[PDB]
Amino acid sequence: GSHMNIGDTLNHSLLNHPLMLSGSTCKTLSDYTNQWLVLYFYPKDNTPGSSTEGLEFNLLLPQFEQINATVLGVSRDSVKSHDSFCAKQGFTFPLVSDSDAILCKAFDVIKEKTMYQVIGIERSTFLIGPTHRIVEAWRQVKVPGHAEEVLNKLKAHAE
Known about the structure:
Distance between the termini: 30 Å
Family: Belongs to the peroxiredoxin family. BCP/PrxQ subfamily.
GO biological process, one term: cell redox homeostasis
Helix content: 25-40%
Largest sheet: 7 strands, mixed
Strand order of the largest sheet: 2-1-5-4-3-8-9
Number of helices: 5
CATH superfamily: Glutaredoxin
CATH class: Alpha Beta
Structural class: alpha+beta
EC number: 1.11.1.24
GO cellular component, one term: cytoplasm
Shape: globular
């Protein structure tokens, strides 16, 4: 089905790709070496589904940080859009503005659906381990309770 799968290792080009984040900050996925990263993709800022998803992760954020994990959300919206969405919702973790669709294509989350050409992000989340391998991959994500399922999966690995 997809070209980024559990067991795959992020390559050097992807690990060093510059990420534009909310707050006008920048990071690369390599900054998360030796920690777990939850990288969650959502279709569009400021929708009922993506604000619920954000809020569910935001509530759990201390529990993730307590076991050496953190969260980054991703859509192709602008930094300006992300900052308005972070502020309105009170998100404490960052959002990647993937405005060149590089992470979206890398993680193979761009899909073609129904209405009614819609090409856009299929809601998807990856749990990336401390050596940059895909440990879990959820595709066609259903929003409610997803952030807690993710947390519990990470806890289940932590034993």
